[PDB]
Design a protein around this ligand. Structure first.
Ligand SMILES: [Cl-]
Ligand SMILES: [Cl-]
Lengths: 118, 117, 117
């Protein structure tokens, strides 16, 4: 599929708790997992959010992975283990307090560089 | 299917959001969707640079992602509920609120190292 | 249908977002989509922690959700428009912008206590 993918993390954990290296690690790990070049992976981390999961304000995250292709039942299970693992290790968020929404984007529906990936 | 998540982005000030608002959203959404509250997630983002129709009046852009429980009649019910809460608690007119509803396939929601498929 | 909404998330600092940018996006999107500006919502989020291709140079991740007016040719036109505006006003290179396009079903957009069904 065309090369783009993007991963967003929204979390209540504080800015101070995001490791140096985290966005770079997300980029490299997602490139590897999706088979996409890192040049076309975008990552976005949003700490300090007002959020709750199950009515509790213990650490949690709501995430999205938008990808042109490379989305499906088995792949998404694999991404979830990878990404929950990174959020647990790096941000100290329990995997049972993380949702990740997966979106398979059509290339014609991803704009870039004044045009689209179609 | 257990999961649902509601996100509100708004231009109203942080100081205007009541202390119990996340808990109220959780409880109200659990009742509206029939899902246990244990698996409802909520997220409120105030102080945003955002306009509705070019105007700086209070407004909101929201999303409700749910595995199931999404459809024409249900979404109407959720809009009345959620616009009502945003009006009552955040003083946002319902005609300056959009809510995008997403019926998520269970295979497309990750949680706890796996997906809901 | 009247509704559309445009969201920009960017790592450019808040002080670099010019006065009047939300209004310009509203007017330009209204012209491009044929929708009245009164039902276009825009949302800009500066100072984000982002990387694009591993780099923290200026970049943006954006969404355009619209009832209708979404398709291959229209999206290419919107990308030229919106990348143009982000370059002109926020000094972001077009090759560091993604815009996700979503054609929303009217029944899945809540507004004013109901939906657009
Ligand atoms: Cl509850
Ligand atoms: Cl530029």
């Amino acid at each position: 599929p065309a090369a783009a993918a993007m991963f967003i993390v929204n979390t209540n954990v504080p800015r101070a708790s995001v490791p140096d290296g985290f966005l770079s690690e997300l980029t490299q790990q997602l490139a590897q997992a999706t088979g996409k070049p890192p040049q076309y992976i975008a990552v976005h981390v949003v700490p300090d959010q007002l959020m709750a999961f199950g009515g509790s304000s213990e650490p949690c995250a709501l995430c999205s992975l938008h990808s042109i292709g490379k989305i499906g039942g088995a792949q998404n299970r694999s991404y979830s283990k990878l990404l929950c693992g990174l959020l647990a290790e790096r941000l100290r968020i329990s995997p049972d307090r993380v949702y990740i929404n997966y979106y398979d984007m059509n290339a014609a529906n991803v704009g870039w560089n004044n045009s689209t990936f179609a």
